[PDB]
Design a protein around this ligand. Structure first.
Ligand code: NFJ
Lengths: 99, 99
């Protein structure tokens, strides 16, 4: 579909068998999701933006469905204020910016 | 144009007469630029990101050219890690996400 930017580009996703709302964010290299107890191996990481850094846990090869489009890639989990779908997954669903 | 997301959507902007590089950031409500000198009056403001809140200088009704498209809106200047073009200006140039 086509998503205008009058409001935040929030969409429903499915990850680890759970539905969530997430931001289609062209400004994020990789995907960051709210704290959640996913299974499997992870590695700790620090990610930075406006206001400084937060500590996250990096999971690899995580399956996320975005408006019916399936994607698989890296996901950082930590105390982010919003779920953020980054370019690593936006490319897999064929998402582009158009103007 | 149509912009794919396998690389950062960086563009050249023109503001205050000078050229700069900025990131098209659909996850940003607001446009925030690194420290610079801009003409006109400004007021203190706060903005929050992934890591917390920072103080910025809010310039209103600033003319800014984004890859040849003109916009006139609010520009925040402060300690952002990256120059980001937010939805307040992306809407002015007709940006949408498509997939
Ligand atoms: C300048 C920071 C960007 C460029 C370095 C990167 N960021 C994405 C950007 O879209 C954030 C997303 C966001 C949205 C709401 C609340 C917190 C964060 N938007 C944002 O800061 O916008 C501000 C201005 O406008 C206002 O509205 C929104 C909040 C205000 S990130 O989140 O920090 C981030 C950092 C590392 C990684 C690794 C994993 O790749 C992934 C994602």
């Amino acid at each position: 579909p086509q998503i205008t930017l009058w409001k935040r580009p929030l969409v429903t996703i499915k990850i680890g068998g759970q539905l969530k709302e997430a931001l289609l964010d062209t400004g994020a290299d990789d995907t960051v999701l709210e704290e959640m107890n996913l299974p499997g191996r992870w590695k700790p990481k620090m990610i930075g933006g406006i206001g400084g850094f937060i500590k996250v846990r990096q999971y690899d090869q995580i399956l996320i469905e975005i408006c019916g489009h399936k994607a698989i890639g890296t996901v950082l989990v930590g105390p982010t204020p919003v779920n953020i779908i980054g370019r690593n997954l936006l490319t897999q669903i064929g998402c582009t910016l158009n103007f």
